[PDB]
């Protein structure tokens, strides 16, 4: 009924392709400029000389307020940064990491960030070459190739694919004497600044399953951590407020995107991410 | 490189 009415919105508004999503989306950037103008999102310690070439790109820099704080290994003189912020679930938690593709000097940063929250499953929207060009550096073990940084040996236990678009990387990590089970899943086919949707909705069911229970936040990047990042997160959430049955009556996409480009810098990057995301929810509710 | 241009 939420369902439905959510639906019957977005018909009357020429669906998709409404001209009313665009404005909605104009809205949102403009939300965006004014926040950073109002000094609501900064980018003080990503702007730092120390910090500057942990930065795949120099326009995307997390956000203070909601920048992911790394203290493992923090006694011994590394440093707390890494281009990463979390976001909030759908229950007020911190439910996700966003963050970019580590490059090879962060790779150790990313298994810091991954071993101190805890984080059981990391989804991967992006590839490591992308046309040109690197986008993402492997962080991963291969078969008969472990991965090792600093004090983390990572292993692959197995790896299998999901469907066509998708891999599963099942690893172990090691760090300490200690073991975790790290699920990584990795869509192949979704361009940045565009969009893949049945296989995408797939890879969150499957994130999902392998959770489990547990306030562990999810990990996702892309390259930059941004457009991809974001549909994903912004999809396992309303996926979340459905299966719970919390959709409200005035249930708003703008309100929700709104929110995550708050958490992290361009959540969801461009207007067609945006459509994509409209139709998604409705599929999801149809 | 810059992402968003």
Redesign the interface.
Known sequence: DSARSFLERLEARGGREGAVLAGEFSDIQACSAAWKADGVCSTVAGSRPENVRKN?????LPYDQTRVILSLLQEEGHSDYINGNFIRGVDGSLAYIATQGPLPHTLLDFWRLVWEFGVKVILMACREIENGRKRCERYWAQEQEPLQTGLFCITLIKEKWLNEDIMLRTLKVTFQKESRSVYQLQYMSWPDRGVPPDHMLAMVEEARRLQGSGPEPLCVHS??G?GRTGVLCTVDYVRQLLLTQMIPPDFSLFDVVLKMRKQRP?AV?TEEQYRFLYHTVAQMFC | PEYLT
């Not at chain 1, 795949?56 to 995307?60: A, E, P, Q, S």
């Open positions: 795949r790109y120099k326009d995307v390259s930059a941004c361009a990057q």
